[PDB]
Amino acid sequence: ELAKQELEHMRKRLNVDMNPLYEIILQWDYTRNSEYPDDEPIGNYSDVKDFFNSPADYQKVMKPLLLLESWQGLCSSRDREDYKPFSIIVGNRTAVSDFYDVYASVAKQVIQDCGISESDLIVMAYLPDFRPDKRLSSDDFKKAQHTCLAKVRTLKNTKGGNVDVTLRIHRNHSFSKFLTLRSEIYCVKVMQMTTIEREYSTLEGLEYYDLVGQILQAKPSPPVNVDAAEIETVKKSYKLNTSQAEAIVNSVSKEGFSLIQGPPGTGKTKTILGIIGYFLSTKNASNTEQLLKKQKILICAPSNAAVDEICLRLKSGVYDKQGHQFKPQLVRVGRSDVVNVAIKDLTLEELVDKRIGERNYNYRNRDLDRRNAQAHILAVSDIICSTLSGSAHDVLATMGIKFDTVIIDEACQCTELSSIIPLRYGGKRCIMVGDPNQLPPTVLSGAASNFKYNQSLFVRMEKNSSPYLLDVQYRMHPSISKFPSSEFYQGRLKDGPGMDILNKRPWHQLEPLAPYKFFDIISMSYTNMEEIRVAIELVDYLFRKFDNKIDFTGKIGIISPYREQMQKMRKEFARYFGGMINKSIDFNTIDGFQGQEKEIILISCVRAKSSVGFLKDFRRMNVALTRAKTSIWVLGHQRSLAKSKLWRDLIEDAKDRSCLAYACSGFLDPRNNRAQSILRKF
Ligand SMILES: Nc1ncnc2c1ncn2[C@@H]1O[C@H](COP(=O)(O)OP(=O)(O)O)[C@@H](O)[C@H]1O
Ligand SMILES: [Mg+2]
């Protein structure tokens, strides 16, 4: 009929009560030494299921895991973050629901120096025997008998450079006996609560989300049928390959979820730029004038860096279905992490500054002018970019706009609740673009990740549906892409034209500095010195032969599965080469290197159980083998690796392709008889 319940469900999704969240957290014990926030039985926790039966089912599983990760956030800040303590003078209190709101005062300089805002959780402690003689730290709070968590509710600047604070605590907490009028109470920040609150909102409002069924069942919509001519038109107009054009036309033509799988270097972000232009132009091509809200598209990614990349790439405009550029109005919601004038000029705050000028350089007017400008800028916008978390910001929630279409880049690098946040504005189409063949996003709680909390929604949906695959890679030399294609993509991942020309390098003319080589080191620990020695000797040969012609600054990375090996690798490289290699070689584990790439990569394999185990090894090998563009030198002991199918496949593939070399310390030295004798007899 007439579904005014859309407005009612919108209202529910945007006004979830946070009090139940703080009913839990404000009864936690900051001093608790545990992986878990309380002593409830471990069986209250369970794995993220592949398939959920209802919103209540989802909430039963997911809420403990969200709170577990939040607990670990408290512990990590307590045990590492060295937040700076301060003190307050207590005033009156007011009972509200299951809470006390406690009023206090503190100097503005202290609020600034200690970085306190209305988003923060703090901890209070009673430390009557403290003397200013000593420096106070969060260790003093961790060891204190009497502590109490408090949520900063309100901060109001007063006349004398002071601030009126409202702190919220739990009614039940015995610490209120210390909060007598005019008492001095010591405090330290625990953590910012914004990210948690937004995820909790999504979790608890889930039943009202338009796409709740597809979420619970992790079931994207079925493909519809699309015109071949339309795909050809998009291919030509957007300068895309076939797989990219198919992914755009199919995913925009249907409602609900679509998954676009992009291996390394296959144009995930480029395809999103095509989605934006194609969506906006086909939507713009659908007795007094009616007033309509302007269609928008909401574009998100997990991190500030990924959002800024999209923003930067949109500044060259987007294109309509006929290939003509147009310049839609773009707003970046949320300040970025980095400083970039290109990104700054797109942020809502700067667009407001430019819209209102120096008129208010009187405070009533300044705030009003800013709010009117904000409303105008958002109303006339075509594209809103934000992080997933930032999509929940007040500035979007107060626009009165349905974002029926949401696009998510880097969609495998977020927890599930995070990917759902932007769907709260009536999301009926969600196109998620990601690479599932990488390590899952890092979470602080190992216990939570053992329950699969570290799994994206994309990955859960991939179990039930085949994504649109982007099948041409534009980064790696063909000798480097060959085995990843055959081993992980059925040989169907192609190279862009001229990958051999683009990635040809001068050292490729000197064996064994080839584009692709497995070095079988002829020689239950997690380190191997002989692999380090061979890595050093390869890089030394490279440098001796080429560093009077080529600047190796930023060109090399050395990775391994194991941190023990990389500690030893860095130590030996530092001893042998001294400070001269700092700017040339980055050292990390495979896991730590996931978002990085280099012209030259050396892998120290060291050595090679379950399905969870095989999955982590599959992801690590996908990552390791795609980090290099021009040269990848894989160092290992064949017998110590061949118990893994992945490594045995890699080694036998390399033999088949004549890309296996025998190595040992001294093998590049013709005068080293001891080494040439080891080699010769082989
Ligand atoms: N269809 C294409 N034709 C030519 N180059 C392409 C194509 N698609 C992607 N590329 C190139 O691939 C590289 C990575 O593109 P990008 O959109 O950053 O991919 P990803 O987001 O998947 O890392 C860029 O150099 C881009 O120009
Ligand atoms: Mg990208």
Side-chain angles (χ1 to χ4, degrees), residues 2-81 83-133 136-158 160-286 288 290-361 363 365-523 525-563 565-608 610-638 640-642 644-670 672-673 675-680 682:
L2 186 65
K4 287 148 158 208
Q5 85 176 250
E6 271 190 350
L7 176 82
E8 289 172 347
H9 287 189
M10 179 78 81
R11 203 181 289 103
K12 294 301 247 186
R13 297 186 301 255
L14 301 193
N15 293 283
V16 170
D17 190 3
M18 297 294 105
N19 285 347
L21 174 64
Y22 287 102
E23 153 92 23
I24 292 160
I25 289 181
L26 295 183
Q27 299 187 93
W28 285 353
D29 177 2
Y30 183 82
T31 73
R32 185 178 165 86
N33 180 74
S34 181
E35 289 191 83
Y36 299 88
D38 60 36
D39 291 304
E40 297 285 7
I42 183 65
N44 288 18
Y45 295 87
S46 66
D47 283 357
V48 181
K49 293 156 44 156
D50 284 354
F51 180 106
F52 290 89
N53 298 132
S54 74
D57 188 25
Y58 191 86
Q59 288 153 349
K60 178 166 191 176
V61 172
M62 293 301 315
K63 189 183 289 181
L65 298 181
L66 174 60
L67 289 163
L68 181 55
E69 178 68 359
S70 303
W71 168 252
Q72 182 63 41
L74 178 155
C75 293
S76 292
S77 289
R78 175 193 73 196
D79 297 337
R80 299 167 186 160
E81 213 67 28
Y83 281 127
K84 187 173 187 164
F86 57 102
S87 76
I88 68 185
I89 290 163
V90 177
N92 307 105
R93 59 178 195 174
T94 295
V96 179
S97 170
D98 289 298
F99 308 98
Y100 286 121
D101 279 346
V102 185
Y103 308 101
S105 45
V106 60
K108 184 180 170 187
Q109 192 59 56
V110 176
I111 287 297
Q112 297 179 140
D113 286 337
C114 296
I116 303 300
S117 91
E118 294 185 354
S119 60
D120 291 339
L121 186 73
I122 69 166
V123 64
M124 304 181 287
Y126 176 62
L127 298 172
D129 301 328
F130 180 68
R131 308 214 91 94
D133 189 334
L136 202 56
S137 100
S138 76
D139 187 56
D140 299 286
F141 291 74
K142 183 181 174 158
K143 293 170 168 42
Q145 178 183 19
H146 295 287
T147 66
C148 178
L149 294 169
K151 177 58 173 61
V152 180
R153 295 275 293 181
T154 310
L155 298 172
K156 290 195 194 311
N157 287 315
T158 43
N162 289 296
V163 179
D164 286 335
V165 184
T166 304
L167 303 173
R168 179 164 289 193
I169 59 165
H170 202 286
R171 274 280 218 114
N172 290 156
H173 206 300
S174 63
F175 192 90
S176 69
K177 70 182 160 182
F178 299 115
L179 304 174
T180 49
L181 173 67
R182 283 181 192 182
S183 287
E184 177 181 13
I185 297 289
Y186 295 100
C187 304
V188 67
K189 179 165 171 162
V190 177
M191 61 197 183
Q192 210 155 332
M193 294 303 298
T194 306
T195 310
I196 291 158
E197 288 184 10
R198 292 167 173 171
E199 291 180 4
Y200 185 84
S201 163
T202 294
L203 172 63
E204 286 292 278
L206 185 63
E207 76 188 79
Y208 300 110
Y209 280 57
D210 299 84
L211 291 175
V212 60
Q214 296 198 0
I215 294 169
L216 296 173
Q217 306 174 204
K219 194 182 176 181
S221 312
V224 302
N225 292 313
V226 307
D227 294 318
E230 182 79 358
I231 290 160
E232 291 303 317
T233 292
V234 167
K235 193 177 168 177
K236 184 185 187 63
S237 293
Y238 292 84
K239 308 203 175 66
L240 301 171
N241 65 49
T242 297
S243 78
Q244 295 166 332
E246 284 174 350
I248 290 163
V249 175
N250 275 285
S251 73
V252 171
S253 297
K254 66 168 119 173
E255 285 192 357
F257 278 89
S258 295
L259 308 179
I260 299 175
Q261 175 173 1
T266 59
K268 291 174 289 300
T269 302
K270 182 167 228 128
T271 297
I272 289 177
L273 305 177
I275 290 170
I276 296 165
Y278 182 72
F279 178 79
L280 288 175
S281 56
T282 63
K283 238 65 224 197
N284 286 326
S286 295
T288 300
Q290 305 298 306
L291 297 183
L292 285 68
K293 294 159 180 295
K294 183 156 85 168
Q295 174 82 63
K296 313 186 186 322
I297 190 169
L298 176 55
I299 312 297
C300 304
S303 70
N304 281 309
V307 177
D308 291 349
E309 184 181 346
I310 294 167
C311 288
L312 280 183
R313 287 173 72 173
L314 284 167
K315 279 184 90 119
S316 321
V318 291
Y319 298 81
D320 68 19
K321 172 174 146 187
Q322 293 70 41
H324 299 128
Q325 186 197 71
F326 65 105
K327 284 176 190 293
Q329 296 191 58
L330 169 66
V331 180
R332 171 71 156 88
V333 170
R335 249 300 191 299
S336 170
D337 269 343
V338 174
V339 290
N340 176 326
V341 198
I343 292 307
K344 175 161 177 163
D345 290 346
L346 292 171
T347 62
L348 174 62
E349 15 282 293
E350 173 77 12
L351 294 165
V352 166
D353 291 352
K354 286 295 154 285
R355 176 152 181 95
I356 68 171
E358 306 185 359
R359 205 189 173 182
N360 302 292
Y361 280 23
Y363 276 94
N365 291 341
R366 193 200 65 197
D367 299 333
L368 287 188
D369 287 355
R370 290 197 71 82
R371 180 66 185 88
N372 290 322
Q374 167 184 320
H376 174 84
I377 290 163
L378 293 171
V380 300
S381 71
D382 299 285
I383 308 162
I384 301 295
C385 288
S386 69
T387 60
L388 287 165
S389 177
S391 73
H393 193 280
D394 262 32
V395 305
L396 296 193
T398 61
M399 274 174 73
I401 282 294
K402 300 180 178 163
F403 289 101
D404 60 279
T405 293
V406 177
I407 316 298
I408 306 177
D409 203 353
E410 304 283 275
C412 298
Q413 285 310 123
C414 55
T415 68
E416 188 163 302
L417 290 171
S418 198
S419 58
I420 300 161
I421 296 177
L423 301 176
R424 62 181 53 206
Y425 309 112
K428 287 181 171 195
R429 170 183 296 105
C430 183
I431 303 172
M432 305 201 294
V433 186
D435 182 354
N437 288 358
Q438 304 204 113
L439 289 158
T442 68
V443 302
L444 302 184
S445 174
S449 69
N450 290 343
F451 291 115
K452 315 213 282 191
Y453 185 70
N454 53 337
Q455 175 183 77
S456 64
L457 184 60
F458 188 116
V459 165
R460 189 160 66 87
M461 290 179 165
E462 182 202 25
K463 290 174 188 282
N464 300 317
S465 64
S466 197
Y468 297 107
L469 178 70
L470 305 187
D471 63 4
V472 184
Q473 71 85 25
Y474 298 92
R475 286 170 65 250
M476 302 182 290
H477 190 290
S479 298
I480 294 179
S481 59
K482 179 68 179 79
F483 175 78
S485 183
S486 61
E487 190 77 3
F488 309 134
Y489 299 102
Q490 291 77 43
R492 302 315 305 155
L493 177 63
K494 299 171 282 217
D495 301 324
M499 284 306 100
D500 55 339
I501 302 311
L502 165 70
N503 291 295
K504 185 180 165 72
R505 293 294 187 270
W507 56 82
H508 290 159
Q509 296 169 30
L510 297 186
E511 284 310 310
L513 308 182
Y516 185 67
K517 195 85 84 181
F518 184 88
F519 291 92
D520 186 19
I521 313 301
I522 298 169
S523 123
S525 167
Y526 292 129
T527 66
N528 187 284
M529 252 309 285
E530 194 67 1
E531 294 180 12
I532 293 170
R533 290 186 198 104
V534 169
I536 288 173
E537 294 171 19
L538 282 166
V539 170
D540 198 23
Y541 189 58
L542 175 69
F543 286 174
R544 291 293 179 203
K545 290 292 190 172
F546 292 95
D547 74 8
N548 67 332
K549 294 172 245 193
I550 296 168
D551 174 12
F552 287 99
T553 299
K555 296 288 177 61
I556 302 164
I558 300 187
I559 62 186
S560 183
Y562 308 109
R563 205 15 149 161
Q565 175 74 342
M566 291 309 317
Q567 290 289 88
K568 190 161 175 149
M569 181 80 74
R570 181 190 283 274
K571 185 194 181 78
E572 290 306 312
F573 265 79
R575 174 194 58 80
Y576 188 78
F577 289 108
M580 62 100 40
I581 48 169
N582 303 329
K583 295 259 158 46
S584 292
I585 306 187
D586 280 353
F587 303 87
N588 216 325
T589 59
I590 291 160
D591 291 18
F593 213 79
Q594 176 157 293
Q596 295 186 64
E597 59 180 6
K598 299 284 174 183
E599 291 201 0
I600 304 169
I601 293 288
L602 299 85
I603 301 170
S604 167
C605 304
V606 182
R607 58 174 305 287
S610 66
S611 280
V612 170
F614 172 89
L615 179 64
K616 195 172 87 171
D617 291 331
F618 171 91
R619 291 162 171 182
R620 268 182 190 172
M621 182 172 88
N622 270 265
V623 174
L625 297 180
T626 57
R627 298 305 86 209
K629 290 174 270 182
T630 85
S631 320
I632 193 168
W633 303 330
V634 186
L635 317 185
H637 184 182
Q638 184 175 168
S640 304
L641 299 170
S644 153
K645 176 178 191 297
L646 297 174
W647 282 117
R648 192 171 173 79
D649 288 352
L650 187 148
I651 291 165
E652 295 293 320
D653 176 76
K655 294 180 192 171
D656 289 347
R657 297 163 55 196
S658 297
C659 290
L660 182 137
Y662 294 108
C664 61
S665 184
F667 79 118
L668 297 173
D669 189 345
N672 185 332
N673 296 273
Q676 296 308 330
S677 195
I678 299 165
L679 290 192
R680 177 174 51 255
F682 246 99

